[PDB]
Every structure is written in C-alpha cells, then in structure tokens.
Design an enzyme around this catalytic site. Structure first.
Site, PDB file in Angstrom:
ATOM      1  N   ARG A  57       0.853  -1.183   0.000  1.00 52.27           N
ATOM      2  CA  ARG A  57       0.000   0.000   0.000  1.00 52.27           C
ATOM      3  C   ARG A  57       0.888   1.231   0.000  1.00 52.27           C
ATOM      4  NH1 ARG A  57      -2.827  -1.267   4.080  1.00 52.27           N
ATOM      5  NH2 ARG A  57      -4.577  -2.121   2.863  1.00 52.27           N
ATOM      6  N   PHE A  62       1.339  10.659   1.845  1.00 53.64           N
ATOM      7  CA  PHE A  62       1.041  10.070   3.145  1.00 53.64           C
ATOM      8  C   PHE A  62       2.152   9.099   3.561  1.00 53.64           C
ATOM      9  CE2 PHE A  62      -2.417   7.428   5.576  1.00 53.64           C
ATOM     10  CZ  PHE A  62      -1.818   7.741   6.781  1.00 53.64           C
ATOM     11  N   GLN A  65       3.606   1.500   2.932  1.00 53.17           N
ATOM     12  CA  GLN A  65       3.403   0.466   3.949  1.00 53.17           C
ATOM     13  C   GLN A  65       3.894  -0.874   3.424  1.00 53.17           C
ATOM     14  OE1 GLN A  65      -0.585   0.179   5.447  1.00 53.17           O
ATOM     15  NE2 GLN A  65      -0.183  -1.716   6.574  1.00 53.17           N
ATOM     16  N   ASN A 104      -0.581  -1.355  12.926  1.00 55.25           N
ATOM     17  CA  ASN A 104      -1.182  -2.210  13.951  1.00 55.25           C
ATOM     18  C   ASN A 104      -2.686  -2.304  13.738  1.00 55.25           C
ATOM     19  OD1 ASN A 104      -2.649  -0.213  15.577  1.00 55.25           O
ATOM     20  ND2 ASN A 104      -0.627   0.544  16.166  1.00 55.25           N
ATOM     21  N   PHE A 115       5.323   1.300   8.352  1.00 49.04           N
ATOM     22  CA  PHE A 115       5.178   2.291   7.301  1.00 49.04           C
ATOM     23  C   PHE A 115       6.286   3.324   7.384  1.00 49.04           C
ATOM     24  CE2 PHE A 115       2.950   5.679   9.789  1.00 49.04           C
ATOM     25  CZ  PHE A 115       2.556   4.925  10.893  1.00 49.04           C
ATOM     26  N   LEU A 124      -1.141  10.355  14.141  1.00 45.95           N
ATOM     27  CA  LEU A 124      -0.803   8.986  14.528  1.00 45.95           C
ATOM     28  C   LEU A 124      -0.042   8.908  15.850  1.00 45.95           C
ATOM     29  CD1 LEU A 124       0.083   7.677  10.936  1.00 45.95           C
ATOM     30  CD2 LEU A 124      -2.065   7.516  12.168  1.00 45.95           C
ATOM     31  N   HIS A 128       0.657   4.735  17.022  1.00 45.55           N
ATOM     32  CA  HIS A 128       1.619   3.911  16.299  1.00 45.55           C
ATOM     33  C   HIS A 128       2.998   4.200  16.874  1.00 45.55           C
ATOM     34  CE1 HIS A 128      -1.270   2.655  13.187  1.00 45.55           C
ATOM     35  NE2 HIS A 128      -1.850   3.789  13.544  1.00 45.55           N
TER      36      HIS A 128
HETATM   37  C1  LIG Z   1      -1.316  -3.874  10.066  1.00 46.83           C
HETATM   38  C2  LIG Z   1      -2.629  -4.599   9.732  1.00 46.83           C
HETATM   39  C3  LIG Z   1      -2.685  -5.918  10.514  1.00 46.83           C
HETATM   40  C4  LIG Z   1      -3.831  -3.691  10.101  1.00 46.83           C
HETATM   41  N1  LIG Z   1      -5.110  -4.352   9.920  1.00 46.83           N
HETATM   42  C5  LIG Z   1      -6.246  -4.067  10.604  1.00 46.83           C
HETATM   43  O1  LIG Z   1      -6.263  -3.188  11.460  1.00 46.83           O
HETATM   44  O2  LIG Z   1      -7.265  -4.858  10.190  1.00 46.83           O
HETATM   45  C6  LIG Z   1      -8.596  -4.845  10.725  1.00 46.83           C
HETATM   46  C7  LIG Z   1      -9.200  -3.459  10.426  1.00 46.83           C
HETATM   47  C8  LIG Z   1      -8.562  -5.061  12.254  1.00 46.83           C
HETATM   48  C9  LIG Z   1      -9.449  -5.933  10.034  1.00 46.83           C
HETATM   49  C10 LIG Z   1      -3.858  -2.364   9.365  1.00 46.83           C
HETATM   50  O3  LIG Z   1      -4.119  -2.300   8.165  1.00 46.83           O
HETATM   51  N2  LIG Z   1      -3.588  -1.303  10.103  1.00 46.83           N
HETATM   52  C11 LIG Z   1      -3.552   0.043   9.628  1.00 46.83           C
HETATM   53  C12 LIG Z   1      -4.605   0.881  10.393  1.00 46.83           C
HETATM   54  C13 LIG Z   1      -4.837   2.258   9.832  1.00 46.83           C
HETATM   55  C14 LIG Z   1      -4.137   3.369  10.341  1.00 46.83           C
HETATM   56  C15 LIG Z   1      -4.363   4.651   9.807  1.00 46.83           C
HETATM   57  C16 LIG Z   1      -5.297   4.821   8.754  1.00 46.83           C
HETATM   58  C17 LIG Z   1      -5.988   3.697   8.238  1.00 46.83           C
HETATM   59  C18 LIG Z   1      -5.757   2.428   8.782  1.00 46.83           C
HETATM   60  O4  LIG Z   1      -6.917   3.832   7.216  1.00 46.83           O
HETATM   61  C19 LIG Z   1      -7.196   5.102   6.597  1.00 46.83           C
HETATM   62  C20 LIG Z   1      -6.038   5.327   5.665  1.00 46.83           C
HETATM   63  C21 LIG Z   1      -5.544   4.199   5.144  1.00 46.83           C
HETATM   64  C22 LIG Z   1      -4.343   4.041   4.270  1.00 46.83           C
HETATM   65  O5  LIG Z   1      -3.471   3.894   5.370  1.00 46.83           O
HETATM   66  C23 LIG Z   1      -3.323   2.653   5.836  1.00 46.83           C
HETATM   67  O6  LIG Z   1      -3.829   1.635   5.365  1.00 46.83           O
HETATM   68  C24 LIG Z   1      -2.481   2.700   7.109  1.00 46.83           C
HETATM   69  C25 LIG Z   1      -1.163   3.522   7.090  1.00 46.83           C
HETATM   70  C26 LIG Z   1      -0.470   3.441   8.471  1.00 46.83           C
HETATM   71  C27 LIG Z   1      -0.294   1.959   8.853  1.00 46.83           C
HETATM   72  N3  LIG Z   1      -1.617   1.295   8.782  1.00 46.83           N
HETATM   73  N4  LIG Z   1      -2.313   1.332   7.554  1.00 46.83           N
HETATM   74  C28 LIG Z   1      -2.160   0.639   9.801  1.00 46.83           C
HETATM   75  O7  LIG Z   1      -1.591   0.541  10.881  1.00 46.83           O
END
Ligand SMILES: CC(C)[C@H](NC(=O)OC(C)(C)C)C(=O)N[C@H]1Cc2cccc(c2)OCCCCOC(=O)[C@@H]2CCCN(N2)C1=O
EC number: 5.2.1.8
Length: 166
Positions: A57, A62, A65, A104, A115, A124, A128
């Site tokens: 991703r 931003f 990841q 997380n 990330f 964050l 995080h």
């Molecule tokens: C690490 C896996 C296991 C975990 N899975 C998860 O929690 O699964 C469910 C929801 C329980 C089933 C996840 O994906 N954690 C995400 C949460 C998040 C944080 C901030 C924004 C988020 C999501 O979304 C809006 C923007 C998204 C694009 O940024 C992203 O995707 C981000 C970028 C920073 C790192 N980042 N991902 C995460 O720490």
C-alpha cells in the site's frame, strides 16, 4: 561499548528492476524491543523476515506500507516474539517524512508491518510506535511513492529485493 543504534538497509526493486537502497537508523536506545524486531526481520536471522516481500500500500502524500511477508497484502505478518507484541512506548513522534513506524490493528498488536512516512502524520502520535527514521535514500522512498495511488494500490510491484544490517 555503548549501544550504537543499528542501521539496516532495503534494496528496492520495481517490477524486478533495481531502484536503489534505503537505509534506516533504528532507535534501539529508546524502543529496544521494537527496534530489535525490525532489525532481526531485516537480517532474516530467525529464518523469516522482509527479504522478498512487497510494499502493498503506497499513498502519495502520506506513506508507504510494507512488512506483510506472509500474505503479501496487508492481512499477514509476524513478529520475532511468537505473538503480536505491546506498544513499547510513544516517546517518539511522527514529525515528518522519513519516520519509520509500526502498523497495527489495535492497542498492543504489533507484528511485522510498518510504514515509512512521506509527510508529517502527527495524528498517529500515541497510536503507532515510531522506532526509526530513514538515514540515506529518502530519494528512493520518493521514487517508490510515485507508484502509489489514492486508494493505495501500486501501479508496479515494489519489492524488497535484499535487506540486512550495515
Ligand atoms: C497492520 C494490519 C494488521 C492492520 N489491519 C487491521 O487493522 O485490520 C482490521 C481493520 C482489524 C481488520 C492495518 O491495516 N492497520 C492500519 C490501520 C490504519 C491506520 C491509519 C489509517 C488507516 C488504517 O486507514 C485510513 C487510511 C488508510 C491508508 O493507510 C493505511 O492503510 C495505514 C497507514 C499506516 C499503517 N496502517 N495502515 C495501519 O496501521
């Protein structure tokens, strides 16, 4: 002697073509358990880790990841501790581009996913765990970032072709 914060590298490839090297300082002086997890996953010394995994991703403006070396899509990964581990502390903040921080799924759910920020992401902070920063090759992160999109899907396959400790 004094504990020197480790330096690790990723050699990045784009559709299998070498792009360049990103190196990171890991703040073992402030978050030793979190730094050690990333360091050992980068050398592969436990028999698993980041080599050959992808950045699944990438959102321009931003972050990039990666770290899901088991399922390759953001649903997997594992730490070196046999279980997901605690948020060690939130001493370090998301201050700008180059910050390396743990992804997380809730409080105290750290695995292997992480990330690299390409912008300041202060919302964050306290959620995080920040545990390192790009040392050299931020330009390579900037090049990777161009292969992302608004929804995070990459337009070319971005891989960690090699990694280890310097
Ligand atoms: C690490 C896996 C296991 C975990 N899975 C998860 O929690 O699964 C469910 C929801 C329980 C089933 C996840 O994906 N954690 C995400 C949460 C998040 C944080 C901030 C924004 C988020 C999501 O979304 C809006 C923007 C998204 C694009 O940024 C992203 O995707 C981000 C970028 C920073 C790192 N980042 N991902 C995460 O720490």
């Amino acid at each position: 002697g004094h504990m020197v914060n480790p330096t690790v590298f990723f050699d990045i490839a784009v559709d299998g073509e070498p792009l360049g090297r990103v190196s990171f300082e890991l703040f073992a002086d402030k978050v030793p358990k979190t730094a050690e997890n990333f360091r050992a996953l980068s050398t592969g010394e436990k028999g698993f880790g980041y080599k050959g995994s992808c950045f699944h991703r990438i959102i321009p403006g931003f972050m990039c990841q990666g770290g899901d070396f088991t399922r390759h899509n953001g649903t997997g990964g594992k730490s070196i501790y046999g279980e997901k581990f605690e948020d060690e502390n939130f001493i370090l903040k998301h201050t700008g581009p180059g910050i390396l921080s743990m992804a997380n799924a809730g409080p105290n759910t750290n695995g292997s996913q992480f990330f690299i920020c390409t912008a300041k992401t202060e919302w964050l902070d306290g959620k995080h765990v920040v545990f390192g920063k790009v040392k050299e090759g931020m330009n390579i992160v900037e090049a990777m970032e161009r292969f992302g999109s608004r929804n995070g899907k990459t337009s070319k396959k971005i891989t960690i072709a090699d990694c280890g400790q310097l």
